Each structure stands twice: as C-alpha cells, then as structure tokens.
C-alpha cells in the first residue's frame, strides 16, 4: 500500500549484487507507480513500474526495464544503447479468492528459478 | 533444453503446497512447449507454456494459467468457472550479454516476493 524504499538482495547469476529502489510518485493520468535506482544520470536508471487496475475483471501489471550504456567517443555524455524490457500481467476475476491469487504469484516466482528457465533465458535455448 | 518433470516446492501463502509438472510436447506450428499437472480430468489442469523466439530482437514468453471449477448441480461432470491468467514477456537484443540477461530474471523473481507485491496482488491495493 504505502510504497517505501524496496531493497532486493543477492540477485543475478551469483547472488552478490544488491539493489535499492526509491519511489518516484504516482502518475495521476493512469495510476502507475514507479520505482527507480538512485543513479547518477537520470537517463540511466533501472526503472520498475507497477499498476493494479479496476473494472469486467481485475488486472495487475509490472513493467521492469534496465538500460545499458557506453560512452561514445564523439561525445562527452553517455548515450543509451539498449534496454532489457520485461513485464508481467496477472488477470483475475471478481470471484477470485485470496489463496488462489497467491498461488499464481508464488508459482511464477518459484518457477523463475527453475533449472528450466535458467537455461531458457541465460542461453535462450528452446525446449 | 531437454525438458523434464519440473517439480516446484513450498508455494502459495504458507509454503505447504508442492506441485509437479509433466511435459506435453512441443507444438510444431509455433514452437510453444507445454507443461501440465497430472490431474484427473484434462479440462482441469494447471497449464504452463513457455516459448523462446528467433529474429530484429529476441523474445521469451511464459504463459501460465490455472482454472478452478465447481460441480454444478444440473450436471454430473464438473464445469470450469474461472481462470487466473498470467504471462511474462522478456525482450532482449542481439548484443545482450549473459550477465545482463540473468540480472533481469533474478530481479523479477526476487521482486515477486517483496512486501510490495504481496500487498499488490493478494489484496489488490494500489500504491
């Protein structure tokens, strides 16, 4: 509810990288909360957006994107080269219970660390 | 790569529910692998599909859906009432390194168990 400084822990290929986030307000036009890493240049900030919805049927989505940049020799400022987009979209109904909603997110969260997807993302192997 | 019987562990609101999956072949029309729980009636099966792509830019998606059903009194067979859809879509580029790809999935996997999203999914509170 009251969004705060969410800090992750032990993430990315070795468990040796941490991450902090700071809130960056709520966009009143569409109700999308944002979180960002306190970087140096605001163009280079690992951004995480989250938005629940209202009715039809319920809808939750999380859009997370990380840019990487390299210093082009023709300029002094760094320029953004590429991103890595990702997003989840949960869709429930009016009659969804609490346990049945929690089952989905915990299944997805534990399935993202399976020996299937670590081969399907880090090396892009099909099945 | 070689997909096998993926078993999860300690998932959903208490850590007391486990889950097993069995492979159900690869659809040759679009290259979408499938996994399912060995249920009684095949209409009631918690299904998990995963598909990496090829080029443009790379694309990985995981579509997971769980149905729930109740026995209507007018019939003997159970009928499906509602689902709980979910899907992730990772998008990388040609020049994405290994570490930078793993960072995204581990950040998402550890962020799905934050004290932010457990309030944003299990009670659907906004921020």
């Amino acid at each position, epitope marked *: 509810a009251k969004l705060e400084t969410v800090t992750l822990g*032990n993430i990315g290929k070795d468990g040796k990288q941490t991450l902090v986030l700071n809130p960056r307000g709520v966009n009143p036009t569409n109700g999308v909360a944002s979180l960002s890493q306190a970087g140096a240049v605001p163009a280079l900030e690992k951004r995480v957006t989250v938005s629940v919805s209202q009715p039809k049927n319920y809808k939750v989505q999380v859009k997370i994107q990380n840019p990487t940049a390299c210093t082009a020799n023709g300029s002094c400022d760094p320029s953004v080269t590429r991103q890595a987009y990702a997003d989840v979209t949960f869709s429930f109904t009016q009659y969804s219970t609490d346990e049945e909603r929690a089952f989905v997110r915990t299944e997805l969260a534990a399935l993202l660390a399976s020996p299937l997807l670590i081969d399907a993302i880090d090396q892009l192997n099909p099945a | 790569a070689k997909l096998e019987t993926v078993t999860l562990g300690n998932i959903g609101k208490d850590g007391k529910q486990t889950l097993v999956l069995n492979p159900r072949g690869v659809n040759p029309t679009n290259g979408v692998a499938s996994l399912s729980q060995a249920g009684a009636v095949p209409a009631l099966e918690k299904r998990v599909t995963v598909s990496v792509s090829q080029p443009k830019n790379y694309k990985v998606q995981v579509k997971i859906q769980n149905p729930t059903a109740c026995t209507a009194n007018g019939s003997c067979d159970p009928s499906v009432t509602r689902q709980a859809y979910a899907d992730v879509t990772f998008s990388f580029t040609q020049y994405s390194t290994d570490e930078e790809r793993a960072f995204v999935r581990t950040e998402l996997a550890a962020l799905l168990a934050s004290p932010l999203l457990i309030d944003a999914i299990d009670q659907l509170n906004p921020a």
Partner: antibody
Amino acid sequence: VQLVESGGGLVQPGGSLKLSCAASGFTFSDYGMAWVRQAPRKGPEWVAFISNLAYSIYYADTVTGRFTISRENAKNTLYLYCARQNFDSSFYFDYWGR
Amino acid sequence: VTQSPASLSVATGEKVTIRCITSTDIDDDMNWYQQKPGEPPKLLISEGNTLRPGVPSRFSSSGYGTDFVFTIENTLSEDVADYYCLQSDNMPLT
C-alpha cells in the same frame, strides 16, 4: 546494534529444536543473515545463508532437517551463532550473537 | 578448500606471516576473523584491503587467487587470539 540467539540445551538424540534470534535495530529487512555455530574444537562451521527477502535460500552439506525461515513480524528468525551480513550483497558478515 | 599454517607466537615484538591458500579457484575476496576466547568473533580487512573501522591500522594483508598473506607489524601488543580465514565464492564457502 546487536542481535541475540536463544535455544535449548538438553536435546535428546533424534529430536529437534527451534533456535530463535531477535534483532535490535537494523530493521531486519534490507539485510541477509546466516547461522553458524561452533564445535568446542573449531570455530567457523557451515553456512545456511538466507536471502534478504527469503527468496534465495541454500543449506550446506549437512541438510537432513535444519530449516531456516525468516519472519518480519517481531524481527526474529526461526531455525529448526546467529550472524548477519552487511548492506551490500556479499558473503562476509560482521555482527554476531552469543 | 582453504588452508592456514600451524600455530605460532614467536615473540611480542615482531610480525607473523599467515598464509591462506585455496586450491579451488582464483578469488579476489578472502576474509579474516579473530576469535578471542570470550566472545563470538570479529572481522577485519575483508574484500582485500578495506580495513573496516574499529580495528587499528597495524593489520595488513595482500594476495590474489590461490595465495593470500596476512601480517601485522613489529612491537605487536599482547592478548593474542587465533585468526580464521574463509571465502565468498562457492556457496558452502567454509
């Protein structure tokens, strides 16, 4: 800012215990932690490093029971020495309990 | 897989060499704790050469993958206690 262990001392061979460990002002989020006790002959034993968010868990070679769990209700951890790592993600750790 | 040399004290006015050698891989991170016989231990200069405050500047180490040397100073003060070495790779991590 400290942190203190608690637990039994006369367990029967075959049974099990539940070590408790309470925090004292590092807010018990934001920070990973671990269990390591010692024999009376040698100090640094195994590690069962918990995540910050109870996501990345792993136990050491002596895994038969010995489950680590973290609950942010009374800032304690349950387990069936109690140390914690620093702010940056790493695997060294600095503060200790008795 | 780590290893430290045998127990020694020599004198109360000299340095002492402690060799942490590791046969698994190459490491940039190798930490040192000290165990006085009254309390649970306390770290020092870990991640190579950080030297977190609370410990005096007399302590030192150097090294790299598969070789680390730890040494202090001459006229080293009293109340010796044993020193332990461990690592931050390979999740059991000794």
